[PDB]
């Protein structure tokens, strides 16, 4: 029943990992919701929100798997946030 | 099958400290400052403080800046 509950969460997470709530001057656009935090990404609750936020101020202008005691996904997020800024910061200089 | 893996972890744990985090540097650096091994520093810190001698020489504006 640990192979099963890994088959569900592997498929019940593809929609989430293909898109933090948005709104409609820029600190009220996207804001963290505190309840719905996985409590194993709580360490990086600020780099996720900061990673996509930089992608939108440029867009409107013009794989992850869960493992225990292994942080292959915690490292995978830092490898994209370290690029999310290098495209926007360079976009303003 | 166990002791063969214990020695490889520890040897890789200690080596990780020296060649990456410079444990050998911190020791030979704290001695330069705390134990006053590096001259021209204690002879310049103590020499400054001793120039004064209460309410002065105690606020973070002089001793946190000296």
């Amino acid at each position: 029943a640990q192979e099963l509950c890994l088959y569900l969460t592997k498929a019940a997470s593809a929609p989430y990992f293909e898109v933090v709530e948005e709104h409609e001057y820029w600190d009220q656009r996207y804001t963290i919701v505190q309840q719905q935090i996985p409590s194993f990404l709580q360490k990086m609750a600020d780099k996720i929100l900061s990673t996509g936020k930089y992608l939108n101020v440029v867009r409107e202008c013009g794989e992850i798997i869960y493992t225990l005691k292994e942080r292959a996904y915690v490292e995978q997020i830092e490898k994209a946030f370290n690029y999310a800024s290098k495209v926007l910061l360079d976009f303003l200089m | 099958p166990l002791a063969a893996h214990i020695s490889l972890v520890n040897k890789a744990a200690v080596d990780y400290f020296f060649v990456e985090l410079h444990l050998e540097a911190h020791y030979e650096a704290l001695r330069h400052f705390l134990l006053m091994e590096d001259g021209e520093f204690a002879q310049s810190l103590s020499d400054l403080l001793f120039e004064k001698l209460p309410g002065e020489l105690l606020n973070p504006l002089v001793l946190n800046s000296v």
Binding site: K69, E70 | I6, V9, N10, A13
Partner: protein, 45 residues
């Protein structure tokens, strides 16, 4: 065989715990306690 097949699966989850940091003779008892904490410390670095 019957006892073995039990012991062979009654230790299955315990190996996983041991598979993280990676009576009986005390010469290795205290060593296992430190052989794991090192792995659990490198995981956070």
């Amino acid at each position: 065989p019957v006892l073995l097949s039990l012991l062979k699966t009654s230790c299955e989850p315990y190996t996983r715990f041991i598979h993280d940091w990676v009576v009986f003779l005390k010469h290795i008892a205290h060593d296992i306690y430190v052989c794991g904490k090192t792995i659990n410390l490198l995981k956070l670095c």
